[PDB]
Amino acid sequence: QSACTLQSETHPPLTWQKCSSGGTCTQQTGSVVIDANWRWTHATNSSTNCYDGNTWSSTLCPDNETCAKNCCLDGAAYASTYGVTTSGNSLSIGFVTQSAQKNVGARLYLMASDTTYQEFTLLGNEFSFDVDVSQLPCGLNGALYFVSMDADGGVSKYPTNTAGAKYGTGYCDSQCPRDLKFINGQANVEGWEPSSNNANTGIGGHGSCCSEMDIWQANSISEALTPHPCTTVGQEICEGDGCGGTYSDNRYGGTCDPDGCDWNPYRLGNTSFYGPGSSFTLDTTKKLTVVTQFETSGAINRYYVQNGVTFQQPNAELGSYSGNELNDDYCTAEEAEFGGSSFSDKGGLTQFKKATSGGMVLVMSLWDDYYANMLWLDSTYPTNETSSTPGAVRGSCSTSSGVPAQVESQSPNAKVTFSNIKFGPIGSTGNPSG
Amino acid sequence: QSACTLQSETHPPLTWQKCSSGGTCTQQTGSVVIDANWRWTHATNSSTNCYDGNTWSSTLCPDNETCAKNCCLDGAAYASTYGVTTSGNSLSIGFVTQSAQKNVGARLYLMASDTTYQEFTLLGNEFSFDVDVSQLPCGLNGALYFVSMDADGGVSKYPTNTAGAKYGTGYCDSQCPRDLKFINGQANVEGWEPSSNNANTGIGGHGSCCSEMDIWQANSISEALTPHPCTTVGQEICEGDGCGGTYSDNRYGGTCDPDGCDWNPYRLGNTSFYGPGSSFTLDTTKKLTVVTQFETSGAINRYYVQNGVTFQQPNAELGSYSGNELNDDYCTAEEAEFGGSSFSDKGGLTQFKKATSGGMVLVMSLWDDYYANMLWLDSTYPTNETSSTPGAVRGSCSTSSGVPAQVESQSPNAKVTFSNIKFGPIGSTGNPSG
Numbered sequence: 044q045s046a047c048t049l050q051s052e053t054h055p056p057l058t059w060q061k062c063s064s065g066g067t068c069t070q071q072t073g074s075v076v077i078d079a080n081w082r083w084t085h086a087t088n089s090s091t092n093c094y095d096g097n098t099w100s101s102t103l104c105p106d107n108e109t110c111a112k113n114c115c116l117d118g119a120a121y122a123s124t125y126g127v128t129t130s131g132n133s134l135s136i137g138f139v140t141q142s143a144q145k146n147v148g149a150r151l152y153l154m155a156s157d158t159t160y161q162e163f164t165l166l167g168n169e170f171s172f173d174v175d176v177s178q179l180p181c182g183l184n185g186a187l188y189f190v191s192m193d194a195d196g197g198v199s200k201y202p203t204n205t206a207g208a209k210y211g212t213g214y215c216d217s218q219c220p221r222d223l224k225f226i227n228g229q230a231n232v233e234g235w236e237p238s239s240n241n242a243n244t245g246i247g248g249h250g251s252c253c254s255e256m257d258i259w260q261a262n263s264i265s266e267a268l269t270p271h272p273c274t275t276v277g278q279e280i281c282e283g284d285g286c287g288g289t290y291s292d293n294r295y296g297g298t299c300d301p302d303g304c305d306w307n308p309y310r311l312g313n314t315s316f317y318g319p320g321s322s323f324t325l326d327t328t329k330k331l332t333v334v335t336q337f338e339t340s341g342a343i344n345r346y347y348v349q350n351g352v353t354f355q356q357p358n359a360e361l362g363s364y365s366g367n368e369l370n371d372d373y374c375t376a377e378e379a380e381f382g383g384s385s386f387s388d389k390g391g392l393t394q395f396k397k398a399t400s401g402g403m404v405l406v407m408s409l410w411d412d413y414y415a416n417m418l419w420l421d422s423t424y425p426t427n428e429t430s431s432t433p434g435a436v437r438g439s440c441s442t443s444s445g446v447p448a449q450v451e452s453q454s455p456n457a458k459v460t461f462s463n464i465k466f467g468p469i470g471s472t473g474n475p476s477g
Numbered sequence: 478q479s480a481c482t483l484q485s486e487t488h489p490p491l492t493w494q495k496c497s498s499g500g501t502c503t504q505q506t507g508s509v510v511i512d513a514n515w516r517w518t519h520a521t522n523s524s525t526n527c528y529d530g531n532t533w534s535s536t537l538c539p540d541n542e543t544c545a546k547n548c549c550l551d552g553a554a555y556a557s558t559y560g561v562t563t564s565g566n567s568l569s570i571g572f573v574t575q576s577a578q579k580n581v582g583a584r585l586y587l588m589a590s591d592t593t594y595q596e597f598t599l600l601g602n603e604f605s606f607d608v609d610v611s612q613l614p615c616g617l618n619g620a621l622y623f624v625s626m627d628a629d630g631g632v633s634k635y636p637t638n639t640a641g642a643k644y645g646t647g648y649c650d651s652q653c654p655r656d657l658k659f660i661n662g663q664a665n666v667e668g669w670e671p672s673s674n675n676a677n678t679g680i681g682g683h684g685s686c687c688s689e690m691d692i693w694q695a696n697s698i699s700e701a702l703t704p705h706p707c708t709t710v711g712q713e714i715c716e717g718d719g720c721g722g723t724y725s726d727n728r729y730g731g732t733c734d735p736d737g738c739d740w741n742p743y744r745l746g747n748t749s750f751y752g753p754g755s756s757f758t759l760d761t762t763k764k765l766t767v768v769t770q771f772e773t774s775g776a777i778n779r780y781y782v783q784n785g786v787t788f789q790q791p792n793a794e795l796g797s798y799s800g801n802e803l804n805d806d807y808c809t810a811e812e813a814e815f816g817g818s819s820f821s822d823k824g825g826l827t828q829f830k831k832a833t834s835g836g837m838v839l840v841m842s843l844w845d846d847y848y849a850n851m852l853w854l855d856s857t858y859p860t861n862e863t864s865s866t867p868g869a870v871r872g873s874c875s876t877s878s879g880v881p882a883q884v885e886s887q888s889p890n891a892k893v894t895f896s897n898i899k900f901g902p903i904g905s906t907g908n909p910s911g
């Protein structure tokens with residue numbers, strides 16, 4: 044797609060700290076940009092929609108190439124349309140925003156300049172952020188994660204994409220998502236099937252795969268840390284059900300691991316660590332600090348800070364594994380005890396290390412879940428299982444929770460605030476901000 | 478040996494913090510006791526010495542068993558004879574102390590009660606302490622480390638030892654030391670050869686081997702972190718040159734690894750990290766905090782704190798290894814690049830994990846080095862090598878430094894202060910002391 048300017052595009056600014064091994068941190072100035080799927084897509088020379096509701100214009104978009112030639116992405120009113128605001132080092136995302144139309148949620152990327160994404164090399168480094176999840180009930184997810192996206196959003200590879208990172212193009216993740224309206228500078232109208240339960244979405248014949256580091260999938264009830272390897276490290280198109288992932292009838296036939304090696308302290312048995320109020324170790328009614336360290340071995344370490352008290356990731360015992368580091372031994376034990384082979388089939392932490400050794404883009408989002416009602420994060424899943432099934436219970440939410448239309452109606456003012464991002468060598472981010 | 482009471486034995490008290498994963502720490506009260514080698518050894522029913530200078534009484538001690546039956550260890554005047562003092566959570570050790578005679582240095586163990594050593598299970602936990610090394614010049618070592626000693630000092634195994642932990646019996650380390658006057662409730666007079674260069678020491682026909690975790694071998698110029706595995710984990714006697722270690726003509730024929738997998742930031746190339754004054758990252762003229770974490774994988778992590786600024790162990794690149802965690806990959810790369818096979822011959826970190834999985838005793842000491850002038854820590858070693866030999870340079874001290882008689886004459890008022898010991902689960906020790 045190209046870019047149009049019926050609405051101007053002004054990326055909300057956002058600062059973050061880059062810290063050094065020598066003990067100081069210095070302020071960086073970036074901004075955030077909304078993913079292209081949230082945007083108005085219209086004809087290049089009029090206001091006629093190329094996509095409307097969950098269907099494409101059959102005349103403007105008869106096939107993927109013609110559609111991309113005829114159509115452009117336009118600018119975003121971040122606060123009034125999308126409920127996205129920033130202040131200094133803080134970003135807030137509202138759940139349901141009413142303007143002329145209803146918008147639900149957002150997916151945002153951190154920029155280096157107004158036309159390029161910021162890339163982070165995670166290996167050997169740590170990433171720290173503060174988060175307020177107090178206003179996230181069952182069925183919502185304020186996610187902060189990384190994906191192996193191109194810094195330009197795909198422009199150099201696909202010259203029929205001229206909109207680029209400035210307009211939030213180029214997304215990929217470990218689900219090989221097929222709901223994207225543009226992939227590789229072509230539309231995804233070919234094979235499009237509108238969603239049965241979502242007025243604004245569908246599934247196309249192509250998907251967009253890459254490595255994904257889920258630092259934070261969370262609400263006020265549950266949280267998880269999850270690497271997802273792929274056999275191709277960076278962004279790559281996939282074909283139909285060959286994609287695998289959430290958007291295909293077969294979850295596992297593709298190049299990415301859609302399940303991941305997840306670490307959820309509740310799921311692993313410590314039901315007292317994280318939740319609302321003073322009966323939990325970390326009180327989710329109040330702001331907390333989350334630090335994630337990528338040691339060169341390929342293992343992942345984690346600690347938290349709240350009211351100046353520090354907590355390592357809680358210890359877990361699973362089969363022959365014991366400890367609080369997310370390493371090969373954990374992931375292998377998890378597959379043995381909870382089931383599955385997707386993580387190891389795709390190469391485990393050794394393959395994942397190829398992603399963190401290269402550049403990945405920071406993503407911050409708020410969403411509800413039209414495919415599985417977020418039950419995989421905060422409830423019992425599958426819902427026929429009981430607590431006697433190892434790993435079935437991931438949180439305290441009812442198995443009836445998180446129906447999107449319900450939570451949209453009941454909790455429209457839900458929101459997440461991410462703040463005080465700090466990045467640098469392991470051991471550096473707790474030192475004074477510049 | 479038995480115990481005599483011509484001089485009373487009052488262990489200087491010392492407190493330390495035991496911290497919990499839930500974020501609090503509580504004060505523990507222990508004490509310190511001096512190793513039996515520093516003590517007066519005399520006949521049970523008179524003041525006649527069983528050992529004097531560096532030789533044994535041929536009448537009281539004609540063989541190892543008769544010697545132990547005839548002889549006892551007596552009490553220690555900690556401050557006036559040995560230059561050992563405590564205050565609250567702080568311990569100070571002076572280098573040369575003049576009373577009726579000259580004493581040099583001390584080796585002390587932390588006690589649980591007045592008759593038992595405190596045992597720590599390091600695996601899954603971290604150990605934090607503050608140290609002032611400002612008064613330690615080239616050739617001295619204020620060492621803090623752990624060894625796999627019996628809590629009773631060997632009494633239950635060797636009933637001819639009735640003095641026990643109260644009198645500092647039962648020492649062992651990864652050198653299989655043969656300079657000990659009592660091992661396994663017997664004397665070590667059989668095979669005794671007085672030291673050519675030390676008026677107070679010698680080498681006997683037996684040694685005492687066990688696993689050794691050198692958390693801190695250091696002075697104001699250099700510091701090293703070094704695990705040493707043994708094929709028998711806990712305390713075990715050895716026979717003559719079969720002992721291996723520093724005290725045998727053959728270093729390597731025995732059950733312990735006397736070299737270890739050492740991590741010295743200077744040796745690995747960062748000559749700016751640790752030293753006296755403001756030109757180093759950590760200024761050794763001032764107190765610093767040292768934290769050592771034993772992750773369940775068997776790898777060791779390390780960070781430092783000074784004036785509220787936190788520094789991870791510096792990154793090092795050695796062969797194909799890169800990072801700041803002391804793991805199998807580091808130790809293997811170290812052997813490939815610097816030379817040697819002792820660490821891996823004895824089983825590496827997998828064998829060492831058997832020690833940290835069990836109980837180890839805390840040792841705090843100050844010494845000079847009659848065998849190698851501490852050159853292995855703070856100088857170029859062997860002294861014929863240059864900086865073109867990988868790993869030869871370990872510190873900035875002259876290869877002429879650390880002659881014991883010289884440093885004893887020139888720096889008698891040298892000293893080390895260890896303080897604010899805190900121990901608990903990984904991530905717990907930076908929280909408030911109780």
Ligand SMILES: *[C@@H]1O[C@H](CO)[C@@H](O)[C@H](O)[C@H]1NC(C)=O
Pocket residue numbers: 063064065066746747748749750758788789790791792
């Ligand atoms: C030495 O290590 C410190 C701490 O990691 C680092 O800040 C400094 O840049 C290093 N210097 C060199 C020359 O490696």
Ligand SMILES: *[C@@H]1O[C@H](CO)[C@@H](O)[C@H](O)[C@H]1NC(C)=O
Pocket residue numbers: 312313314315316324354355356357358497498499500
């Ligand atoms: C949960 O984890 C916290 C932090 O490690 C720990 O303090 C608490 O005791 C744990 N509770 C249970 C039941 O495991």
Ligand SMILES: O[C@@H]1[C@@H](O)[C@H](O)OC[C@H]1O
Pocket residue numbers: 289301302303415419
């Ligand atoms: O959405 C994914 C879910 O379907 C899977 O089961 O667990 C990982 C999540 O990212």
Ligand SMILES: O[C@@H]1[C@@H](O)[C@H](O)OC[C@H]1O
Pocket residue numbers: 723735736737849853
């Ligand atoms: O004293 C030992 C030294 O001889 C060796 O070379 O390195 C390890 C030290 O403990």
Ligand SMILES: [Co+2]
Pocket residue numbers: 249282
């Ligand atoms: Co195709």
Ligand SMILES: [Co+2]
Pocket residue numbers: 338340342368772774776802
């Ligand atoms: Co590790």
Ligand SMILES: [Co+2]
Pocket residue numbers: 683716
């Ligand atoms: Co013998």
